Swiss-Prot record:
ATP binds at residues 10-13, 69, 200-202, 266-273, 337-340. It comes from Bos taurus. The N-terminal nucleotide binding domain (NBD) (also known as the ATPase domain) is responsible for binding and hydrolyzing ATP. The C-terminal substrate-binding domain (SBD) (also known as peptide-binding domain) binds to the client/substrate proteins. The two domains are allosterically coupled so that, when ATP is bound to the NBD, the SBD binds relatively weakly to clients. When ADP is bound in the NBD, a conformational change enhances the affinity of the SBD for client proteins. The chain holds residues 3 to 384 of 650 of the full protein. GO terms for molecular function: ATP binding; ATP hydrolysis activity; ATP-dependent protein folding chaperone; heat shock protein binding; protein folding chaperone; protein-macromolecule adaptor activity. The gene is HSPA8. This is Heat shock cognate 71 kDa protein. It comes from the Eukaryota.
């Protein structure tokens, strides 16, 4: 046969891992990136997936598709679909009740179901793993949010099937995160687990009670439209204002300039998680004007103070809906890159009155890690 893989098919980014020789290896893509944008793009000559698709988004916005995870398993008339369509530069059309993304591709109008778009992302993840392993990869466990219904689950499975993957099982993202930390294998009775998942575009809080290998979902809360990208946007707005004051130019409607500034801001955010300052270095940001400056960790925290504090309300709501006190939480699990932000960890740890956080597994990789473990179990190789 071949190696079984765990795939986190994320809203904004995806990640693939493999369990072998007693260890999970998270697999780097051809750019050396351990996560891959959940982006597909269509041009005059080719279809682009992942990094290559995201890299040309400002030059080809209406034919660059993302957020298929917000469409998958839903109907066109869905209130969620109608709302979300407003914020996408690509077209969504109705095919006999079902949403389809419509693009131009090689001088032709083509349309794709959300699960076809996700199949393309899954194809890239498959090829990434095959490039690393030197072997054909067919079996996989693919993750979804706990709140996904059977239509969403089936459509996610269907995306894998279209990609040529044998989907062994669709498992919940918070379950995968808990499996990564071996929280179902502790010597004891019930364990109440809080998963704090602050992703690129979504914030999910999940409370699980694990006992006898059952991962009971007690509560879910969060914000479907809050993620690391919001914190990046506060930085983007900050520097747009700065460039206006410095140079009397509003760069807002130059898509390329704004995209480049955003990329710089994403990088600065990562750097600010392990350093107290970050350099912004952009050659010819606008009209040949260089933008070289810096931002301190304190200023980044100040720009996002409301959004950071605000993450605690879903935690309180999850607790209330699960009928549990703060002190009844056995384990706290960090998932999503934004959970590396020192201020967020401090906020969450203070909220739990000094309780230690499970954060040793790269939070951006924890879900694919648990998926890879489960994949090994299901294929019979753990």
């Amino acid at each position: 046969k071949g190696p079984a893989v765990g795939i986190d098919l994320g809203t904004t980014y995806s990640c693939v891992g493999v369990f072998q020789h007693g260890k999970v290896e998270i697999i780097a893509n051809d750019q050396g990136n351990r996560t891959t944008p959940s982006y597909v793009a269509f041009t005059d000559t080719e279809r682009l997936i992942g990094d290559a698709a995201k890299n040309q988004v400002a030059m080809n916005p209406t034919n660059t598709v993302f957020d298929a995870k917000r469409l998958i398993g839903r109907r066109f008339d869905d209130a969620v679909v109608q709302s979300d369509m407003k914020h996408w530069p690509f077209m969504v059309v109705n095919d006999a009740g079902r949403p389809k993304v419509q693009v131009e591709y090689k001088g032709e109008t083509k349309s794709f179901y959300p699960e076809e778009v996700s199949s393309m992302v899954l194809t890239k993840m498959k090829e990434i793993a095959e490039a690393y392993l030197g072997k054909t990869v067919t079996n996989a466990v693919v993750t979804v949010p706990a709140y996904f219904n059977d239509s969403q689950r089936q459509a996610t499975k269907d995306a894998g099937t279209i990609a040529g993957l044998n989907v062994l099982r669709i498992i919940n993202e918070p379950t995968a995160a808990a499996i990564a930390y071996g929280l179902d294998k502790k010597v004891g009775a019930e364990r109440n687990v809080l998963i704090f998942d602050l992703g690129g575009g979504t914030f999910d809080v999940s409370i699980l009670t694990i006992e006898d290998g059952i991962f009971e979902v007690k509560s879910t809360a969060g914000d479907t439209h809050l993620g690391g990208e919001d914190f990046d946007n506060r930085m983007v707005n900050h520097f747009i204002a700065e460039f206006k004051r410095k140079h009397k130019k509003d760069i807002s409607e130059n898509k390329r300039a704004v995209r480049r500034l955003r990329t710089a801001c994403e990088r600065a955010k990562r750097t600010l998680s392990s350093s107290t300052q970050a350099s912004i270095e952009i050659d010819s940001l606008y009209e040949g004007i260089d933008f070289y400056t810096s931002i301190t960790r304190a200023r980044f925290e100040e720009l996002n103070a409301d959004l950071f504090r605000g993450t605690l309300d879903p935690v309180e709501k999850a607790l209330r809906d699960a009928k549990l006190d703060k002190s009844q939480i056995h384990d706290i699990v960090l998932v999503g890159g934004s959970t590396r932000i020192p201020k967020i960890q401090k906020l969450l740890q203070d909220f739990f009155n000094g309780k230690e956080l499970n954060k040793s597994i790269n939070p951006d990789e924890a879900v694919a890690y648990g998926a890879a473990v489960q994949a090994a179990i299901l294929s019979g190789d753990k």
